[PDB]
Amino acid sequence: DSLSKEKLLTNLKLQQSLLKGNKVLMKVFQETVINAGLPPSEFWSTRIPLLRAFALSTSQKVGPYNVLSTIKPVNKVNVNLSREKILNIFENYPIVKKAYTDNVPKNFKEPEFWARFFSSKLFRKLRGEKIMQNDRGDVIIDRYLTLDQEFDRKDDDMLLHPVKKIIDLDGNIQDDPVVRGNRPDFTMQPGVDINGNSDGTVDILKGMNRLSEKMIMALKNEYNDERNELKIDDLNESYKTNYAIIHLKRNAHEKTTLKVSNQQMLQQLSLVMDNLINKLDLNQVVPNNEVSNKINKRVITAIKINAKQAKHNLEVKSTLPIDLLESCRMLHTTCCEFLKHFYIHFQSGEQKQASTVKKLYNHLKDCIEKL
């Protein structure tokens, strides 16, 4: 989709925003793409993972959640309204965005709009609170209440669909259509008022079920099974691993760029026998004060070589001033970038882009001349 290499290469605005956000990469960019004439597509070719990371840093969004349940007060009471809270209010409740679009640029400003909305019956209805007629609401916001109920009716249109017979609870009560048994009592029935009308407590249940369905169906976007469901996986055979096994041959070829007889073997062994029996004079290990000179010279020369190497082994301090050191550093950086692009095009192995290889070779020759 949008995460492919060519989509990131052609995305000028995302590259410009990454350039604006970052600071250390600008020394490379303004000296290579602009001051050295390297094409920006070649520059962003080697930084495709960086572009993908910067794309995924901002393209992702949080999951849907009951944002109005999180919104609670704290006489004066205050509530903190994050921008993502506003976005989630709009996404989860399109009625609030619909009331936002035709009022905020038209009649009153946005903080006044949210102050009116949190004092309205629409907010209590969307929060699952039971609506009571003694509350004042807000006369501007409450005009959408009938249209909010219209949106609730429309939400049942694309949510209602036939289900599998495993969980078809509608057909369970329709299995016997002519059943006429005893009517269930008031405990088995929704609550009623003194007049027998509905008390509205089932409305909040339907509202929260609708909210859950809306959250679930929001995941359903572009962003025989009964046999599999009813199978007892424990009674089936255990999963057998199909991991590949390897057998290694150790008969490698030998490295490429006067055998002794058993008689002299035994003679030398018996010589060591008698030389260990007669006397092992440990005082014979002392050198004759001449070979020790050569041994000490060899060891001290090896030490001098190693110590001169290991005398000096965050970057190190430089004798250069910061101006000349930074000029050498940015010249080295643009030379390394040119070399990387030249080697990519050189080892790519395509005859169609040999002109780019020639241009990069000319750029490398110019880098040699600049050095």
Binding site: L12, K23, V33, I34
Partner: peptide
């Protein structure tokens, strides 16, 4: 300076927009 850097990038973007134009 960051401001003149942003001016150079805006000029480069304008040159690119002229290139598509």
């Amino acid at each position: 300076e960051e401001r003149e850097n942003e001016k150079t990038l805006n000029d480069y973007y304008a040159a690119l927009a002229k290139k598509q134009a």
